[PDB]
Design a protein around this ligand. Sequence first.
Ligand SMILES: *[C@@](O)(C(=O)NCc1ccccn1)[C@@H](Cc1ccccc1)NC(=O)[C@H]1CCC(=O)N1Cc1ccccc1
Ligand SMILES: *[C@@](O)(C(=O)NCc1ccccn1)[C@@H](Cc1ccccc1)NC(=O)[C@H]1CCC(=O)N1Cc1ccccc1
Lengths: 305, 305
Amino acid sequence: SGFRKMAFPSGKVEGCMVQVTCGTTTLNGLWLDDVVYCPRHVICTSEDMLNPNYEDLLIRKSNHNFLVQAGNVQLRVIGHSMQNCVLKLKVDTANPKTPKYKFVRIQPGQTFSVLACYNGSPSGVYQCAMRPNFTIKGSFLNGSCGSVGFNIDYDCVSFCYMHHMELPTGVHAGTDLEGNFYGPFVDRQTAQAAGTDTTITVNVLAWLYAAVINGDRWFLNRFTTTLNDFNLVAMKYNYEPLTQDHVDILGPLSAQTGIAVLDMCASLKELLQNGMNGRTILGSALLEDEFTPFDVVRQCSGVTF
Amino acid sequence: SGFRKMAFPSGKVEGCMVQVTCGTTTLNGLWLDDVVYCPRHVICTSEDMLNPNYEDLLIRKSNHNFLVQAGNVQLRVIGHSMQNCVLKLKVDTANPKTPKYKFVRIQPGQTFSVLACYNGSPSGVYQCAMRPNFTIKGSFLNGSCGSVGFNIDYDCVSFCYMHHMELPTGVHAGTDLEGNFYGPFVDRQTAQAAGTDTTITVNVLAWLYAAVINGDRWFLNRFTTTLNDFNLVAMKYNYEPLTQDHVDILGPLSAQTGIAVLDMCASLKELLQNGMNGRTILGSALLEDEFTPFDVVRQCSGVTF
Ligand SMILES: *[C@@](O)(C(=O)NCc1ccccn1)[C@@H](Cc1ccccc1)NC(=O)[C@H]1CCC(=O)N1Cc1ccccc1
Ligand SMILES: *[C@@](O)(C(=O)NCc1ccccn1)[C@@H](Cc1ccccc1)NC(=O)[C@H]1CCC(=O)N1Cc1ccccc1
């Protein structure tokens, strides 16, 4: 029993973190096989970040201008290339701790673990989600750039996020490991505003199933609804529309609890309209949207890695 | 910016987890140097757990009755002993991944990371606190016994918790690594009721400082108070009394924000009396009490390991 915001065990990723320095700029890199991946703005001064031309700045850089340190030992850089907003530094040594891995680009609503790092050293691990506006609500300080987000399937690490930027509103922007930003964000110190941070409806429903599995049941109501009716309410409350694809993904939790997905939608509709009335669900006074249906099944079934 | 329920990186602990089997009972063990630590009820059947005599059950056990498996390889057991509610299995191989470590017994209100494990394999990592009633609000399923809780100081893992029991109310009980239960709990399948789960006041104050550091300031009020006045309110709302020792521990956060500890107490007093009025602080609709003052300083300063 119990339900926690649970991260993946971080060991396989801890073994990949390095420090990358170019001139006076130091940040984190990810060392997999004989390549180190890091944000391309390692080549920028704070001044350069106001309006950088990355191709032009890279002409002034050679392999020996990139200092890579792994557990206080220097790696030899034998090539470098820019792919979108990341740099790939070829080193002469394969990381002996390289896990089985993939690079994936995740969809809004998908959760992942972050290993927040500074100077190539881990600070902490926490669970995030890709918000519908393609920001993440991380916990990051100066020097966190190059920290990564990931999921694990048994022994395989799927890297989905590298941290680049903090927006003026204190939310976070970054790339996949191919260097493509999530959302419209750019690696420039220019005012960049986020869109509406809508609530991830399928995740809220997953968490209400988690609540029922854990015996928190006060919010279960006498009503059902339809997708179209529910979605009129979702739109009013800045919830993402629910699709039949979302209903399909919730099938296993519906089967485990015997609560039809549209019945749970009707219970959520009443919570949105009535509020909590000072009550809690799984120790929260608000509806939690950073557990996916797969996260709930994983945590409620004790899947290991 | 941002503030997350952040766990310690789990790699150093992942390298210590093993599976222990005695007859038909399998659970998790912690392998440090040439000793494996596990709950003593590994020797019990489900039937035995209703009223076990551990000394009597242990007479029927030899070294070869304890099966220890580390990453799918068997360890040879060359001695065993019971210390309070844990077993210590001496093995013929020192764990090559043994980190620098200490065993500590924590106080109510102190936080730690849990590496939830099943069959000696990590499932996930999350942040907990020792509640004032000496329970923890974990996330644990059947087979989680022997999972551990820990803190890290740079390179040194301080183990503070081993998971044993789930109480009928779905909260968790366990021991330090010397096998002494936190609180009055026993390793027997008997109804055991927890005391009042009071709110950890010094931790709430720490988190309000975190909120101010992050620019969440709406709750800052025009008032101050005294320890005695504040504590009359704390008692009414099932908050732990605040001591001058707590005021002293909050000094660094007071200094960073320029908000006197008793001024922050007065702001908390008004929140308890007025409620949130549907507002949030650091994305929570309730006052969070599982960040210590040290946790807030660590997360807000980017301390690494
Ligand atoms: C890196 O881009 C970074 O950490 N970004 C993510 C981030 C930043 C703040 C909050 C949350 N997330 C990083 C690279 C860098 C640049 C120059 C020197 C060293 C490293 N950039 C920074 O840390 C930025 C961000 C804001 C800022 O003032 N700053 C420069 C800086 C660096 C070191 C000390 C103070 C200020
Ligand atoms: C172990 O004591 C344990 O996991 N306890 C912590 C816990 C349990 C449930 C929820 C949260 N935390 C563990 C040892 C054991 C005993 C027999 C066989 C294998 C392992 N005990 C159990 O898992 C207990 C707890 C409740 C229960 O029904 N059960 C026995 C069991 C074991 C395996 C499958 C089903 C049931």
